[PDB]
Amino acid sequence: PVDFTGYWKMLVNENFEEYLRALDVNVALRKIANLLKPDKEIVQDGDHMIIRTLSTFRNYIMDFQVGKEFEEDLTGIDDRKCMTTVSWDGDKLQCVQKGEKEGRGWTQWIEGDELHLEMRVEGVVCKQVFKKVQ
Ligand SMILES: CCCCCCCCCCCCCCCC(=O)O
């Protein structure tokens, strides 16, 4: 129902260190991750979506079909594998990442001209907000 396509620049990033710590990311990697302001480059055609999380250190690329569970390879983040499902909850996207860590997933939605992302794991919540450049 909503087209997320766009190049979205980071405005807000709250509790990212704590989120990474809960994924057992080591001190050195967390240190460099502190230097980052990752952006989102999204291309969508209906339920087919590509979400590229772009940073000067490393990118993380998702390419999936909404509604279809898949094996997600989190190489570059925590190098884990999850059984992951992204679903439409109205105009919002809900992602559950089944695997080692409890409560791992995210929710993505647009409010006005802002892209909102809430990342979760083990009760930790990281809030990110992005905007296209007008
Ligand atoms: C570990 C340092 C690398 C950090 C650079 C990439 C940041 C990725 C953050 C975790 C994965 C984000 C998943 C994106 C989901 C979404 O945007 O809908």
Side-chain angles (χ1 to χ4, degrees):
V2 172
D3 191 347
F4 291 101
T5 296
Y7 190 97
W8 300 91
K9 282 196 62 162
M10 180 171 273
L11 292 175
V12 175
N13 190 14
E14 301 184 13
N15 219 36
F16 192 42
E17 191 85 335
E18 294 76 3
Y19 174 84
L20 295 179
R21 179 160 62 257
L23 298 180
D24 307 305
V25 172
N26 69 19
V27 173
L29 201 56
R30 259 147 58 209
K31 187 176 189 175
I32 192 164
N34 202 45
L35 296 179
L36 312 183
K37 299 177 286 187
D39 299 318
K40 302 288 172 172
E41 186 192 87
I42 300 176
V43 298
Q44 178 183 340
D45 184 352
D47 283 352
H48 174 49
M49 199 175 296
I50 299 179
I51 303 175
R52 302 180 74 226
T53 301
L54 303 177
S55 86
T56 58
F57 173 55
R58 183 175 289 154
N59 302 328
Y60 177 63
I61 309 306
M62 299 189 75
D63 184 336
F64 57 86
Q65 188 79 6
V66 182
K68 181 171 183 170
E69 191 174 44
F70 64 99
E71 292 80 41
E72 189 185 9
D73 182 336
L74 292 133
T75 294
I77 303 174
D78 64 339
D79 305 318
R80 291 194 176 91
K81 294 183 181 55
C82 291
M83 287 180 59
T84 296
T85 306
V86 183
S87 58
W88 288 115
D89 164 22
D91 286 342
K92 298 188 171 174
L93 277 189
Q94 298 284 8
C95 177
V96 177
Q97 297 169 286
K98 295 297 194 182
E100 174 58 23
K101 298 301 183 185
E102 291 294 305
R104 192 178 182 159
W106 51 258
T107 305
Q108 177 180 293
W109 73 101
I110 286 167
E111 298 198 11
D113 52 17
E114 310 173 338
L115 181 66
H116 287 253
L117 179 65
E118 181 178 282
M119 300 192 301
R120 300 175 291 272
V121 64
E122 290 190 341
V124 178
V125 179
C126 168
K127 170 175 173 179
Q128 300 179 343
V129 186
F130 310 79
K131 195 169 176 183
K132 301 186 201 179
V133 184
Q134 290 181 42

